[PDB]
Amino acid sequence: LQPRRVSFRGEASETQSPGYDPSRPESFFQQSFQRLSRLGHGSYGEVFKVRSKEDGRLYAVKRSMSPFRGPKDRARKLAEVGSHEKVGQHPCCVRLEQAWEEGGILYLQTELCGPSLQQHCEAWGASLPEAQVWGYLRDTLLALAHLHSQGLVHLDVKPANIFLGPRGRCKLGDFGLLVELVQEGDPRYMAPELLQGSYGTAADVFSLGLTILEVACNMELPHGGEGWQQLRQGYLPPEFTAGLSSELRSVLVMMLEPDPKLRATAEALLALPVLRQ
Numbered sequence: 001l002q003p004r005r006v007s008f009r010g011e012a013s014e015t016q017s018p019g020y021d022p023s024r025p026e027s028f029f030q031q032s033f034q035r036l037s038r039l040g041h042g043s044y045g046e047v048f049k050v051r052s053k054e055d056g057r058l059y060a061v062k063r064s065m066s067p068f069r070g071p072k073d074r075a076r077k078l079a080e081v082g083s084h085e086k087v088g089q090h091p092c093c094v095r096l097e098q099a100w101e102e103g104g105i106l107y108l109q110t111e112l113c114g115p116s117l118q119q120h121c122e123a124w125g126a127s128l129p130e131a132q133v134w135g136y137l138r139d140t141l142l143a144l145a146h147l148h149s150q151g152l153v154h155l156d157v158k159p160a161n162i163f164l165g166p167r168g169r170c171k172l173g174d175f176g177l178l179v180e181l182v183q184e185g186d187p188r189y190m191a192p193e194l195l196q197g198s199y200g201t202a203a204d205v206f207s208l209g210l211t212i213l214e215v216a217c218n219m220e221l222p223h224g225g226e227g228w229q230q231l232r233q234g235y236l237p238p239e240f241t242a243g244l245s246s247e248l249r250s251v252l253v254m255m256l257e258p259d260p261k262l263r264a265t266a267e268a269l270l271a272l273p274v275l276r277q
């Protein structure tokens with residue numbers, strides 16, 4: 001059984017590693033990485049914190065759970081590698097180092113950033129200090145501005161797909177649903193125009209608006225029903241918005257504009273005085 005490199009522009013490496021012995025039963029992932037801990041898991045598979053056995057660097061490796069069920073299953077999983085290729089390098093985006101397949105399992109090796117914003121909020125156990133929130137909002141807007149300037153829509157912006165790096169910075173990741181101007185999204189963060197089949201970069205700004213609202217108010221977002229509709233009418237529900245500053249509420253209202261034709265872009269938001277460097 002051979003591991004096959006899933007090639008993409010920007011992989012930084014063209015070759016197996018000297019430690020890989022193809023005559024051994026263990027997988028390339030087993031032979032080439034020291035497994036340190038499991039960062040997360042789900043129906044998609046597992047994400048491990050690893051050290052490369054070749055150069056000792058820290059990486060994050062995600063592997064799918066079950067072998068490819070067929071060509072379409074494989075194409076859907078491999079598309080996440082193509083999306084990383086379309087994103088390219090940016091300081092606020094998770095960099096894909098390399099990807100390969102073995103035994104029908106897909107492996108994605110990225111830079112190690114840290115826990116997801118969802119995990120960080122679970123540990124903090126309250127509304128995040130608003131100064132931390134502004135930094136995450138700005139860093140993810142920088143990421144969104146990079147994607148949107150290239151005609152890319154993330155379509156899955158949420159705390160689980162933002163990852164914290166050192167010194168309070170974060171990076172947008174998990175590009176499995178990214179499309180170049182489509183799969184089922186998370187309805188909690190879904191822009192209203194997506195229901196009517198209208199897809200644009202504006203949908204990411206709305207999703208980030210609800211993402212910031214969630215972490216800054218420690219409130220759980222509704223999957224549907226009347227509460228879902230409350231958040232798509234241009235106003236903020238009054239209970240949890242009490243603690244937000246005038247400036248933060250002001251930005252969130254701009255991001256949650258229901259009409260995508262009128263909704264501010266990532267570049268417009270980053271040019272506001274409140275979002276200055």
Ligand SMILES: Nc1c(-c2ccc(F)c3[nH]ncc23)c2ncc(Cl)cc2[nH]c1=O
Nearest residue numbers: 039040047060062108112113114173174
């Ligand atoms: N890079 C990190 C990832 C990660 C791993 C593999 C991928 F293909 C990715 N795409 N986008 C992000 C990722 C990561 N995944 C899950 C959890 Cl719970 C924490 C994580 N922490 C990280 O720093």
